[PDB]
Amino acid sequence: AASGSALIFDEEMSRYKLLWTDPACEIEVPERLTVSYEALRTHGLAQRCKAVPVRQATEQEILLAHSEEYLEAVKQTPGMNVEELMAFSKKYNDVYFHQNIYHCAKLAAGATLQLVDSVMKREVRNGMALVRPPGHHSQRSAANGFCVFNNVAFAALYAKKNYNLNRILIVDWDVHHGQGIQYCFEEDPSVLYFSWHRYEHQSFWPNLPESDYSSVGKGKGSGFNINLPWNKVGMTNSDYLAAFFHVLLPVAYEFDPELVIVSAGFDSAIGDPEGEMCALPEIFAHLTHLLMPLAAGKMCVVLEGGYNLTSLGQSVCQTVHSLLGDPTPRISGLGTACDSALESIQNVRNVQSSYWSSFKHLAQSETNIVWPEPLKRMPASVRTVVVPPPGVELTLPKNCQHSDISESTAKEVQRIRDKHFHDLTDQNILRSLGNIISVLDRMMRSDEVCNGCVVVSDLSVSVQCALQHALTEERVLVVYVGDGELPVKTNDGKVFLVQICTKETEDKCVNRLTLCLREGESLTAGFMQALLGLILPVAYEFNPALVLGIVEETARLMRVWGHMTCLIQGLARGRMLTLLQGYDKDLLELTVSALSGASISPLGPRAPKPEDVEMMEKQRQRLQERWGLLRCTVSESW
Ligand SMILES: CC(O)(O)CCCCCNCCCN
Ligand SMILES: [K+]
Ligand SMILES: [K+]
Ligand SMILES: [Zn+2]
């Protein structure tokens, strides 16, 4: 029932700055805040967000993650002159103090709590806070790396105390390691901390041995801290997506968090002087999108780093775009991760194998400066178009609408009939072909309609008209559940077929991925592992212009179809056409709700069957040489 996105911001947090020459801190400027908000204003995103006000974090809230001694010392900084502020700043590592920074730090902390309360009270579905100073380096008794108070650490502890949450996920995609968060939740299994960061074999700041992949936590919390070190610069979109598909997402979806907090540092984007990575700002549209199915969309994005003012503004807009549900931009040129990234991904999965089900099979040997401006992202006039069987009135959300075959469209169905289906005059089945062409014409030719769902009776004729009409326009991904062959040719390079069936069928084709999941209670955990580890990696590298989902009537499927429909909307700008054979009121309502951008119910509780993981890893061995994004280990060299 929650809707809308909160944008917490206040220009007061830009009224402190570095007052002496210091090459280590010159990049942390107030302009990072003003450029970010002005970019959101230019693209119309701020106007679409609920402007929740900023407040000061109280002393009792600061003491949640900081000591009385450190709070008392920072509290005296407003009364210090420039000379005394230099003496206080050199007691810490790479951080400056201003006479207004204590005031702003309480605002940056209070802003994060305002976002947490807005999300947990269902007043908004998600939100982002544009705060300054950052926080993820701050520790219990020390300022560190431009950070005074650990804003994200506050949010997790705040949501624990005031809402009795048992599982909170923190995703730190800033290019630096948020060691302040790791120290805070080292022994806490209730707060899962994931962080990738420029490491370069401990040669990069903050040069900490505990920033490596071997630090998995301590005590009752071991396995709930996940560090992914980047040992070379220049990491690309393929490296970031490999990290998500093969490390973060498989852990996050079986952890099943009740709230997702993001340490959103954009110094991991291209052009940044600190990160020196090569990921485009568009990648953050998908990093946000792939996490939104978690915790029923309850996602609190908190700003951290980001120092290229041009790259910062573009990356912020791509994040808020996805938070508002706007379509995701297509990502081209995706392939395998580099050797250094595959090594880091390899080592993390190995050390985490003793803690998570998705990596359990790895433990035993019997099992195993200038870049182009991003395109304009615009939400469709109506997002989803539904056509139920004739005479079936349904209650649709405000994002949806029924079909009204035009005269030009009706002439198209006639010439198609008088060529391939000469003997076919069963009225309703013929009229379903008119709806398919009507929806597809509205999806591809204009930004009026994004996706749609069509209920059909005869499959082979319906899927043939759908696919052949979309091809005669570039590339279609087909995800079909059910058995038997379909009128789909995968000989050229225009179609990729994902089939989930019950009877095992040898593929012998590189453009086909057949998943034979054995019927059982663990079918939910098996499908989720194949979705994150196989289906999504090939779909993102394939980069289709349209997704065609097909569900035969003789469809277990109910629990996972919503998650697939949401996640798969990261492909093809969200343009997905779903063909459901037969009428299932529950399946159609679940399909339309996910297509319309609504939040999906969590899966909650596990571990899949070893025969399924064995089948899935055989699929990866057969396809990873063509689709490199499937690789999660370093390739063997001749
Ligand atoms: C939030 C954040 O992770 O971006 C903070 C970055 C800390 C920078 C460390 N000092 C490097 C000196 C550069 N010459
Ligand atoms: K990080
Ligand atoms: K932890
Ligand atoms: Zn950073």
**636 within domain boundaries:** no
Tell whether ligand 1 has an atom less than 6 A from the beta carbon of residue 172.
Answer: no
Which residue among 345, 367, 389 closes a domain?
Answer: 367
- Burial code (b: 16+ CB inside 10 Å, e: under 16) for 620-631 equals beebbeebbbbb
Confirm whether residue 239 is marked as ligand binding.
Answer: no
Q: How far apart are CA 293 and CA 549, in angstroms?
A: 19
Question: Sign of dihedral through CA atoms 527, 528, 534, 537?
Answer: positive
Which residue among 308, 333, 367 closes a domain?
Answer: 367
Which residue among 367, 402, 422 closes a domain?
Answer: 367
Residues 292 and 418 in one domain: no
CA geometry: angle 587, 588, 590, nearest 5 deg = 65
SS3 128: strand
Residues 473 and 523 in one domain: yes
**608 within domain boundaries:** yes
In what order do the strands lie in the sheet containing 5-8?
Answer: 5-8, 126-129, 299-303, 260-264, 168-172, 191-198, 225-230
The residue to which tokens 């949450």 are assigned: 165
Residues 158 and 201 in one domain: yes
What are 225's strand-pairing partners?
A: 193
> For residue 538, which of 275, 115, 245 has the smallest C-alpha distance?
245
- CB neighbour class for 209 (10 Å; exposed up to 12, middle 13-18, buried from 19): exposed
Q: Which atom of ligand 1 is nearest the CA belonging to 273?
A: 13
**637 within domain boundaries:** no
Q: Which residues have CB atoms below 5 A from the ion given as ligand 2?
A: 172, 174, 195, 197
Tell whether ligand 1 has an atom less than 6 A from the beta carbon of residue 306.
Answer: no
Tell whether ligand 1 has an atom less than 6 A from the beta carbon of residue 304.
Answer: yes
Domain that holds residue 521: 379-631
Residues 569 and 536 in one domain: yes
**373 within domain boundaries:** no
Q: Which atom of ligand 1 is nearest the CA belonging to 274?
A: 13
Tell whether ligand 1 has an atom less than 6 A from the beta carbon of residue 133.
Answer: no
Q: How far apart are CA 180 and CA 622, in angstroms?
A: 42
- Give yes or no: 137 in active site: yes
Residues 398 and 350 in one domain: no
- The residues, ordered by sequence, that sit 6+ positions from 223 with a Cβ below 8 Å of its Cβ are 189, 216, 217, 352, 354, 355, 356
**465 within domain boundaries:** yes
- Burial code (b: 16+ CB inside 10 Å, e: under 16) for 502-534 equals eeeeeeeeebbbbbbbeeeebbbbbbbbbbbbb
CA of 116 to the centre of ligand 3 (A): 19
CA of 151 to the centre of ligand 3 (A): 16
CA of 257 to the centre of ligand 4 (A): 25
Residues 118 and 78 in one domain: yes
CA of 91 to the centre of ligand 2 (A): 24
Residues 284 and 163 in one domain: yes
Q: Which atom of ligand 1 is nearest the CA belonging to 267?
A: 4
Q: Which of 43, 66, 136, 137 is catalytic?
A: 137
> For residue 537, which of 520, 509, 513, 565 has the smallest C-alpha distance?
513
Residues 533 and 604 in one domain: yes
> For residue 186, which of 143, 216, 153 has the smallest C-alpha distance?
216
Residues 332 and 411 in one domain: no
Breaks in the chain listed by the residue before each, with C–N > 2.5 Å:
368, 403, 473, 555, 605
Residues 400 and 276 in one domain: no
Q: Please report the beta strands in 201-311, taking only residues with DSSP state E, as ranges in sequence order.
A: 225-230, 260-264, 299-303
Tell whether ligand 1 has an atom less than 6 A from the beta carbon of residue 94.
Answer: yes
> For residue 150, which of 121, 126, 120, 185 has the smallest C-alpha distance?
185
SS3 170: strand
Domain count, the chain: 2
Confirm whether residue 136 is marked as ligand binding.
Answer: no
- The residues, ordered by sequence, that sit 6+ positions from 142 with a Cβ below 8 Å of its Cβ are 70, 92
- Nearest bound ligand to the CA of residue 167: 3
Q: Is residue 34 within 8 Å of 10, Cβ to Cβ?
A: no
Residues 263 and 404 in one domain: no
- CB neighbour class for 148 (10 Å; exposed up to 12, middle 13-18, buried from 19): buried
Confirm whether residue 267 is marked as ligand binding.
Answer: yes
Ligand 1 mutation target, pool 92, 94, 138, 303, most atoms within 8 A of CB: 94
Q: How far apart are CA 530 and CA 244, in angstroms?
A: 14
**372 within domain boundaries:** no
Q: Give the N- to C-terminal CA distance of the chain in Å, as an integer.
A: 56
Q: At 576, phi and psi to the nearest 5?
A: -130, 130
SS3 628: helix
Q: How far apart are CA 258 and CA 443, in angstroms?
A: 34
> Which residue's CA is minimally distant from atom 14 of ligand 1?
24
Residues 434 and 521 in one domain: yes
CA of 315 to the centre of ligand 3 (A): 27
Chain centre distance of CA 360 = 24
**Resolution of the experimental model, in Å, one decimal:** 2.7
